[PDB]
């Protein structure tokens, strides 16, 4: 029902990695495996077909092979743009019945680290007129893609009404995230200071809004 | 360019219907297939309809799938009946390479004879010599891929967003933004100055609140107007963003 792939594969820049695709005689064993590359924000791209043939425009660092019921996608030299989810596939008993692999998330290590840039927006006048107040903490340009966010108000940590997204890769190959503090209008005016504290690789970048000046 | 069109929100136990057309080209001379991916899960084959009008389907889902063409074969439709929350996925339209060849085959440890058109030669239980068999070889792969249409199956109804301007309080770089708040379903598209802003724009992935409406923000590092489009609710808001006068 599904071809087995490793859940994730890691490698550093310029290193060779391989992604296997384990099926059975009914699919992979027939020797016409294809490979697909899924990058967020872009359409899926076909990399390999017929076990070894490269699609148009695909770099020569991608290569495919097959030994019995296991096919392999090989990247000879890793680049940052190669970070994606990779899927194998094959027909089964018909040219219209196909099964995909389980997917392999590829990560390319060794990229240069960078602290997060933090921007904290206060609630707008329009939202405050509706008796609501959302504080918006936007975090960008950090690598690696791991960040811890802490909200504070007059020196006290706020744990309720906080929603934080996971880190997502940007177009410049560094990561982004955002955090939301959903308050009422009266709550926003009761405190004198609100802070978004973003900790990344042991270093904390803090931004603060004061209602008395917004 | 392959384009999938259809609703982004469907109520459970109803029929999800999607259409695929091509821009720059015609689907009439190519086989067209459907592939979907649920969030955090593998790609899943749905089916295809070749140039001969014949439809093939994922066997485990055949009883719920219907893939049809029109008279010109310029547009291809997909129907998924009796949908549940498991049918929430991004649905892709593809062009598919499909060829069935008949070649001679041999058992384990046997090889075909030279220029046969046929007996097999090797060592095994069949003897040194045995007759080859004509077997179908299935060639299949997805060629072109559409951008995909995100479909959410849910009982919650459509909710248009509220767009609020974002501006700092009272610099080297002035940062403004727009908060696309409390909308359903995904997605929304955000541009700035009708696309005249090429760089300095960062739109962040949406968050899903304890409530259950999504919210995202876009910000520009520099009048400025964010163009928020929520096609599901036929909403288009162009919110002017002005920094505080102070």
Residue numbers in the entry:
A (entry chain B): 2 to 9, 11 to 216
B (entry chain A): 3 to 119, 125 to 177, 182 to 233, 241 to 264
What did the original publication write about this model?
Under these genetic constraints, cattle have developed a unique mechanism to accomplish antibody diversity by forming the broadest distribution of CDRH3 lengths and the most frequent occurrence of cysteine residues in CDRH3 loops. Consistent with the five structures solved previously, the 7 new CDRH3 structures also showed a long “stalk” formed by 2 anti-parallel β-strands supporting a compact, globular “knob”, further establishing the stalk-knob configuration as the general structural peculiarity for the ultralong bovine CDRH3s. The compact globular folds of the knobs are maintained primarily by several disulfide bonds, a feature that is similar to the core of other small disulfide rich proteins or domains such as voltage-gated sodium channel antagonist mu-conopeptide, CnIIIC.
The two antibodies with 4 or 5 cysteines (BOV-5 and BOV-6) both used a cysteine pairing pattern. In every case except for Bov-5 (having a free cysteine close to the C-terminal end of CDRH3), the cysteines occurred in pairs, and every cysteine participated in a disulfide bond. Two or three anti-parallel peptide segments make β-strands or β-strand-like backbone conformations in the knobs, and the first disulfide bond forms between the conserved cysteine residue and another cysteine residue within the second segment. A typical example of this feature is the knob of antibody BOV-5. The knobs of antibody BOV-5 and BOV-6 form one-layered structures without the second layer seen in antibodies BOV-1–BOV-4. BOV-5 and BOV-6 have relatively short CDRH3s, which might be due to deletion mutations in the region encoded by the DH2 segments. DH2 deletion mutations have been observed in bovine ultralong CDRH3s, contributing to diversification of bovine antibody repertoires. Interestingly, deletion mutations in the region encoded by the DH2 segment in BOV-5 and BOV-6 reduce “two-layered” knob structures to “single-layered” ones.
